[PDB]
C-alpha cells in the first residue's frame, strides 16, 4: 500500500520522536559500571523542515526519570533512578 | 514520575523503530525526509549489536518541486527493517 503524500509529510515534519539513546551519551564518566539496559527510549527532536535554511531544534526541554540497573562487574548490582534529557517541543528555526 | 525497570528494559531492546531518514541544484524533494523502520536499541552485553535480519521496501509519494516552475507527485521506494536481532560484533 503506497503511503500517500499527506501522511508522509505529516509524519516526517520536525517533532519530538522516540529515540533510542545510549546511556554513555548522558553518563560518559562511568567506565567502572555496566548499566542495564545500556540505552533508553527518549523523546528527541527529529524530522525535517520545509526549507533548507531552517533546522529542527528543541524549544522546550526537561528531564525524564527511569529505573536503571547499575552493575559492578563481579560485585553485584543495584537498581536506581537515573535522569535523562528529553525534548518537549521542537521547531524549525533559521540556521541563522 | 518514573519509568519502571521492566518497561525501560523491554522498550529499549533491539527492535525496528520509526526513524526519520533524509532522502538524500535543480529540484527540491518534499518532504526531504521519510519515516522508516530502522533497527535500533540495545542488546544484553557490549559484545552484541542490533542488526537487521529481514528487510523489505515500502513505496511513498514524494513531491518533486522545481521552485517557481512546477511540482509533481512521484513514487519512491525506500528500505525498511522488518526484523532485528542481537548478534556478536566484529
Amino acid at each position: 500500500e503506497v503511503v500517500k503524500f499527506m501522511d508522509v509529510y505529516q509524519r516526517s515534519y520536525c517533532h519530538p520522536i522516540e529515540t533510542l539513546v545510549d546511556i554513555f551519551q548522558e553518563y560518559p564518566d562511568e567506565i567502572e559500571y555496566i548499566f542495564k539496559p545500556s540505552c533508553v527510549p527518549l523523546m528527541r527532536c527529529g524530522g525535517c523542515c520545509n526549507d533548507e535554511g531552517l533546522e529542527c531544534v528543541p524549544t522546550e526541554e526537561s528531564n525524564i526519570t527511569m529505573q536503571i540497573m547499575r552493575i559492578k562487574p563481579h560485585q553485584g548490582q543495584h537498581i536506581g533512578e537515573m535522569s535523562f534529557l528529553q525534548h518537549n517541543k521542537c521547531e524549525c528555526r533559521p540556521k541563522k | 514520575e518514573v519509568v519502571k525497570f521492566m518497561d525501560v528494559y523491554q522498550r529499549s531492546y533491539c527492535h525496528p523503530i520509526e526513524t526519520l531518514v533524509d532522502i538524500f541544484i535543480e529540484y527540491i524533494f518534499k518532504p526531504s525526509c521519510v519515516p522508516l523502520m530502522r533497527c535500533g536499541g540495545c542488546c544484553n552485553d557490549e559484545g552484541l549489536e542490533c542488526v537487521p535480519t529481514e528487510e523489505s521496501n515500502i513505496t511513498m509519494q514524494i513531491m518533486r518541486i522545481k521552485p517557481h516552475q512546477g511540482q509533481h507527485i512521484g513514487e519512491m521506494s525506500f528500505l525498511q527493517h522488518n526484523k532485528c536481532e542481537c548478534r556478536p560484533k566484529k
Binding site: - | 509519494q61 513531491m63 512546477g70 513514487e75
Partner: peptide
C-alpha cells in the same frame, strides 16, 4: 533515486486533474 512521476500536483499533493 528511482522517483517515478505520478502527476502534476497542487500544494497539498493532490493531482491537478483531481
Amino acid at each position: 533515486r528511482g522517483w517515478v512521476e505520478i502527476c502534476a500536483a497542487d500544494d497539498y499533493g493532490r493531482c491537478l486533474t483531481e
